[PDB]
Amino acid sequence: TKTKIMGILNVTPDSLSNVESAVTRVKAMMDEGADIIDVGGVSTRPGHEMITVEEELNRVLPVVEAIVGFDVKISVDTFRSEVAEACLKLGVDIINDQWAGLYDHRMFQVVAKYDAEIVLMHNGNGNRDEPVVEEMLTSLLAQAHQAKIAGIPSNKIWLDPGIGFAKTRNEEAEVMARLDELVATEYPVLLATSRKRFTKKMMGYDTTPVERDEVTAATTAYGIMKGVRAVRVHNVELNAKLAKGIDFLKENENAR
Template identity: 45%
Template sequence: MDMQVNVRFIDNLEQAKAEIRAIGSDTAGIGLMAPKGVHRVLKISGVNPKQANIIKQEMLSKGGEAAITRGAVDHSVETTDVLLMATLKQYRAFIDKLKMQPFGLAKLAASISEALDNLEGRKVRVLNCRGKELEIGRRTLVMGILNATPDSFSDGGRFTEPAAALEQAHRMVEDGADIIDLGGVSTRPGYSEISSEISIEEELSRVLPVLERLVQEITVPISIDTWRAGVAQEALAAGAHIINDQWALRGDPELAGVVARYQAPIMLMHNGQDSNYRDMMAEIAGFLRQSIEIARQAGIPREHIIIDPGIGFAKTYEQNLEVLRRLKELTVLGCPILLGTSRKSVIGNTLHLPVNERVEGTGATVALGIACGADIVRVHDVKEMVRVARMADAIVRGGAGEG
């Protein structure tokens, strides 16, 4: 038989170990070789020339590479980005040396180590939703959208009456929804300002009558889509389980404290006032990282935090596609990822279809989103997207979609 050359794409340490084990190597050899089989590229921003030169020197000494701007060598620039390129084995040795360096580099070493840990594949974890538990990571969870609003871009006015909303919620649960996301204010894609079009009283009048019926009859956790602390307070007191904040704790400074007091999970979505970015994915990650810190400072544990890249918010059509293409980069934050693309304009602009004809486009974004790291998908068409998610899970998670 002629010798053949094939390729293996290895995403994490466990995959590397499995490939080496399949060759027949002994256990000790697997442990030594596997870290050489995983290559990572990390980008660090805001590095001063003194730090950059030490980083480059230490990484080169371990056999890796560090790209810095030319001006960092002669200190003619104030800061530089650094692109690190190395195997896990090289990173380990590099981190050990960096821990011993001055100028804040020991702290950077800890951040690099944390980032590398977060990239080691999906972690199965249990999310305690105020007594109701959700297992995240074993399969993709499906969040069904329930709009108690007269002006939602997709189904405005259909479920404003509690009876109609309850019937729709039951239907979504029967179709496989793991979470019901109830909202009382329209958050139209493309709208990037904190909405105060309706009062807190009006938002509560839309949400609470529906919520009171849902918590009595619906078995899955109920999420409330709001950025207002006053609404969250009343909703959690009435039995809601999760808060879904489209402003990632930037819209109301009191919201984090409310969520912490009720020990509820929170979903933090990237948003902004415009779509002007220098390095979009880095800035989205930075925004979410800051919101995670706000949450933790308020007493919300990290295991209660879910992040959302905010498709359709503070992003152009091309930027939305780029976020979807590069979604996997957000796994560096170490939090489950919620993806909300259902029927949005990025699909309409691609396929030139109205809102009610975007199910196939939504399915494509759901499947590719799962492949790129999404753990929860927020959708209107629950039955169809549960099927898409199960098929995607069977491929991406190795049969986890069965059953």
């Protein structure tokens, strides 16, 4: 089918980016073509301090509670089962786990409990004994099997290469050049490179985040041609409109 467009909603201020004002943005995102709304309030980067579970729920639930009643799939960016279960009780559809269940292994039992979808992102401290691609596939496939043991079917298990996590710009380029190997897993692949430092290397010069939406859409079109099924972007309108063109051209070539 179509490539799902996952919009970013950051609860907190962020360098790359109120309840009533958040709902206004959520309504704007779907009009720009957002298929999924990823609500996040955490960051697994080393340049941050981990916040308590109670603080995280005070961040996501006021916005989630308002938006669960819309005609859109809702994704929650969290790696702690207590936060995901609380959102799953409200009726969210996707749990975006940045640690792929490594931080909290109860995430698989909770997501499978509510018959929901889970995103498994490749992450780490940056150390590995094998090449980044082989290490990424080894780590993700092991976590993907753990979700299937819990009862989650393969269609509902998403794989994210984790661009910007435990990788250098050279290791990120090695992953982006071999995206077909990650799609060969037959799991739906989610690509998230919106306004990231990888994007900065594509232009070759120092830029602000908002001027990296064009090269972000380039990764979107390139990813769809490789076989990815969803993209996590900031600029929904540019990527959702561009993805529809690539999906149109890919379906047109397959039909003819």
